[PDB]
Amino acid sequence: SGFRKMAFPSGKVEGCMVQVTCGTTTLNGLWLDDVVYCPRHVICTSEDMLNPNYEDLLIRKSNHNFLVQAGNVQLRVIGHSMQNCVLKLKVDTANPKTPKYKFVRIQPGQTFSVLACYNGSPSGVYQCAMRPNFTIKGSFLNGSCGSVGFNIDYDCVSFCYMHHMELPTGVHAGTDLEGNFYGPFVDRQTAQAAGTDTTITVNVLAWLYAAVINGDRWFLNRFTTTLNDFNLVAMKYNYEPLTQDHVDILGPLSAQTGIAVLDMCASLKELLQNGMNGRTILGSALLEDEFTPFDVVRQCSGVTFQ
Amino acid sequence: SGFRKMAFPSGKVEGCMVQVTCGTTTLNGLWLDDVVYCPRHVICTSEDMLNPNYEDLLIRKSNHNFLVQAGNVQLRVIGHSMQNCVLKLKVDTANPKTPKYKFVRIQPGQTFSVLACYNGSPSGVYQCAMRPNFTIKGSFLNGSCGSVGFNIDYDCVSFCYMHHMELPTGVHAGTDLEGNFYGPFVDRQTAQAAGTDTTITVNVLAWLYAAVINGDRWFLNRFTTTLNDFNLVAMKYNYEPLTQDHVDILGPLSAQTGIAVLDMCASLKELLQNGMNGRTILGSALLEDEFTPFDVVRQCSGV
Ligand SMILES: *[C@](O)(C(N)=O)[C@H](C[C@@H]1CCNC1=O)NC(=O)[C@H](CC1CC1)n1ccnc(NC(=O)OC(C)(C)C)c1=O
Ligand SMILES: *[C@](O)(C(N)=O)[C@H](C[C@@H]1CCNC1=O)NC(=O)[C@H](CC1CC1)n1ccnc(NC(=O)OC(C)(C)C)c1=O
């Protein structure tokens, strides 16, 4: 009972967070086995940031210019390399708290938890989605760079995001753990703007199913719709196209509630056309689009991690 | 920048969660030192749950009836006792991951993180306020009982809530870690209901400050209100009276933004009277009251 925006338990990731310092610059790194991953811009001064040549700047560094701290233990750096926009520091000590992990690249619409960190110390955890415009709506102050996003599957931590920068309007951009940016952004202090964002339609539908599961049913109407006719209406409200794959993905929640996906689509079509008229759904006055179908099932069925 | 509902990192608490089974009931316990804390209704059969005589039920139990598992490992129960609505199971092994901790009783309007768990295994983390009506708007399924709420200050975990029950409307009730319920609720199967709730005024003002700090400033206006005139309006909308103590508590946010509390109050009055006319604040179309002044400072400064 109840429905809440919920993050994964963060403990397995907390035990991987370190502080990385290069000259004057400090930010966070991810310690897994005998490697620390962090944003490559740790090697820049503020001077360099307008248009840094990272290959050149790194050549001029040595292992000893990297101070890595795990709490109050310094980790000795014995190698370094750059992969895209991440720096990999080889250290002489493997992290005893390394979880089972993998590195994944997520798609727009997918959600994940962020462990916000400062100076290598976890400070808070919250749930985000990769927006269609390849930004995230995060909460990040100076010092947060190198904080990561992740999912847990059973015992396995999938790292999908490392934080690098803030864009206009206070949204955020970063890379996968191979250092490739999500979106067309670059790690440079230069004019960049996100494209126009859109609503993640499949997620709105997941959350309408969540609503029904939790006893909110006022928006259910007597109609069905074709996929085509739904998309005609939804594109007019800056909604992402709903695909057959999305319809297929919503199948389990459809069967659970006994409301056909295209019947839910017809309800959403009416909500877009007529508004919510001051009413709320699951305690929100807007349609929520940062719960995936999986997120809904997970929360409504109580799936667990150890 | 940016402003998100944010829970504390849950690792220190995760290291304390165990599974407790008695008979056919399995739920969660909190393992600190050599004691496991859980809801006493773990000892009930469903027929007991009508008006359980806990004292007498517990006398009939053996330490052997309590199956406590921490991951793979069975913890032998060597002692049991009861404190209000909480059961304490002494075990023969002290939790090596016990953090620095305290048990606190939270006040209505204050917030805490919940670690929802099932079968002693962590499921998820989220933030709740203790409502004025002594409920929390949580997300809990069968098996979640014994999940706890907490705040972390530096390295010290302040435990403030343990989960016992759901109420009509899909809200939740529970106890402090001494087993005393928040609100007038009782741990038995009997029809119970939350009283009428009120909106935490000071928290709404904190969140409006958070909005301004993050550059969302459209609702600011050149007007001010007296404290009394503010309360006359807001109390019509079932907002808690704003006291001078509240105004004082907001002083750091007032100072950070340069907006006096009674200036911000004029925004709030106008939002209540006229609504948002299609606009949002920090991406919400409603006024949010589950962020404390501390939560906003913490998040807009980065502790
Ligand atoms: C990161 O370097 C750190 N040490 O924490 C930092 C994190 C940001 C600080 C405020 N919010 C953040 O998310 N990143 C940066 O400061 C980047 C570094 C660049 C290599 C990527 N950075 C530098 C300069 N400017 C910006 N943003 C900016 O100008 O924002 C506007 C467009 C909104 C004005 C930036 O992110
Ligand atoms: C808890 O015992 C557990 N094993 O997890 C459980 C948690 C709830 C189940 C669904 N979501 C929860 O939060 N608690 C209960 O089942 C309590 C036990 C009572 C001693 C306190 N309980 C028992 C009976 N009824 C209710 N409430 C109830 O039926 O609420 C309705 C009217 C909204 C359906 C209850 O919480």
Residue numbers in the entry:
A (entry chain A): 1 to 306
B (entry chain B): 1 to 303
Lines from the paper:
The active site of SARS-CoV-2 Mpro features a catalytic dyad comprising Cys145 and His41, with Cys145 being covalently bound to the N-benzyl-α-ketoamide in 13b. We established structure–activity relationships for the 13b series by modifying residues at the P1′, P3, and P4 sites.
The analogues 9c and 9d featured electron-deficient pyrimidone and pyrazinone heterocycles, respectively, and 9b was substituted with fluorine at the 5-position. The pyrimidone 9c and the pyrazinone 9d inhibited Mpro with IC50 values of 210 nM and 380 nM, respectively, and thus were nearly equipotent to the pyridone 13b that displayed an IC50 value of 380 nM.
